[PDB]
Every structure is written in C-alpha cells, then in structure tokens.
C-alpha cells in the first residue's frame, strides 16, 4: 500500500474519532479498527478501517505500544497530519 | 483479551 498523509481537523472538545488496536508490544502495527460517524476522522474521509498508523504530525509510532500511541495521539491538537498505509 | 482504545 502506498503511504499517504492525511490532515484532519479537530475541535478542542472531540476526539480524533477512531478506534485503534495494536501497537509493539502485540507485534502488529497501531490499527484504525473503528471510525466513528459525524467526528473529525469521518469528517475528513481519508482514514479507513485497516489504516495503519505509522506516525503522527512527524511522530513516529512504527515501534510504540499501544499505550503510548494513545498517548501521543490524544495529546494532537487542531489541524493534524497522519501518514497512513492500508494494510 | 484483546486491546482497543477510542480516541
């Protein structure tokens, strides 16, 4: 799959949108497995059930586990590049 | 036993 980068926009009181799954410590990519309707990630229509995500405005997460995935992806504010590739 | 986070 090719990468692509993605920008979403997000509102300070919504979420990204997703679900993810994986991470290193489950030896599989973070996975989006879920996006939820009517919020940033569905809003911006770039991101799909079965996107890994490789990193996040520069951070990689190719190797992070899924706690500290979550973490860093929480902590993202307003206009927000993903670099994606379909599994 | 499997990990999924809503973000």
């Given at each position: 799959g090719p990468?692509?980068?993605?920008?979403?926009?997000k509102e300070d009181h919504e979420?990204?949108?997703?679900?993810i799954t994986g991470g290193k410590?489950?030896?599989?990519?973070?996975?989006?497995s879920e996006i939820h309707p009517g919020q940033p990630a569905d809003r911006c229509g770039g991101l799909?059930?079965?996107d890994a995500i490789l990193a996040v405005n520069?951070?990689?997460?190719?190797?992070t586990?899924?706690?500290?995935?979550?973490?860093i992806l929480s902590q993202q504010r307003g206009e927000i590049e993903?670099?994606?590739v379909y599994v | 036993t499997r990990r999924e986070t809503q973000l």
């Amino acid at each position: 799959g090719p990468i692509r980068k993605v920008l979403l926009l997000k509102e300070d009181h919504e979420g990204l949108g997703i679900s993810i799954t994986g991470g290193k410590e489950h030896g599989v990519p973070i996975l989006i497995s879920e996006i939820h309707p009517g919020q940033p990630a569905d809003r911006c229509g770039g991101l799909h059930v079965g996107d890994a995500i490789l990193a996040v405005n520069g951070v990689n997460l190719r190797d992070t586990k899924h706690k500290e995935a979550v973490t860093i992806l929480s902590q993202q504010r307003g206009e927000i590049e993903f670099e994606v590739v379909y599994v | 036993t499997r990990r999924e986070t809503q973000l």
